[PDB]
């Protein structure tokens, strides 16, 4: 139940998939804050960060491939 955004100044970005690949599952789909801590504000900000990633193909929408 660690929110990396507790010490993460330079708030969530859509290029740091190095950090983003932890908030998803094997399938590529976002994880719930009730299971990964992640204060709701930063959970929403990283939700749209992951969505912008997916758009830039830095993350897959599904694991179909």
């Amino acid at each position: 139940f660690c929110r990396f955004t507790a010490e993460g100044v330079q708030e969530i970005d859509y290029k740091d998939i190095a950090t983003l690949k932890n908030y998803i599952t094997e399938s590529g789909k976002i994880v719930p804050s009730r299971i990964t801590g992640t204060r709701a504000k930063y959970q929403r900000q990283l939700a749209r960060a992951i969505k912008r990633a997916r758009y830039l193909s830095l993350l897959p929408y599904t694991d179909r491939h």
Partner: protein, 65 residues
Amino acid sequence: IKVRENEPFDVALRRFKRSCEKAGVLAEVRRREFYEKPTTERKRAKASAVKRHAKKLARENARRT
């Protein structure tokens, strides 16, 4: 949704399947649009979730023994 399951497996081991989505979305989206029951069912189950939290708070009893 996909696993190699190295042939020294002898197992199902597809707990990823029934742990991530497969039936949690499919058998409830297969039909039934209705546009309004999601909120009704949502707050029925959410009253039950807050009731679980109330159980966890007030779980101090005497066991009848």
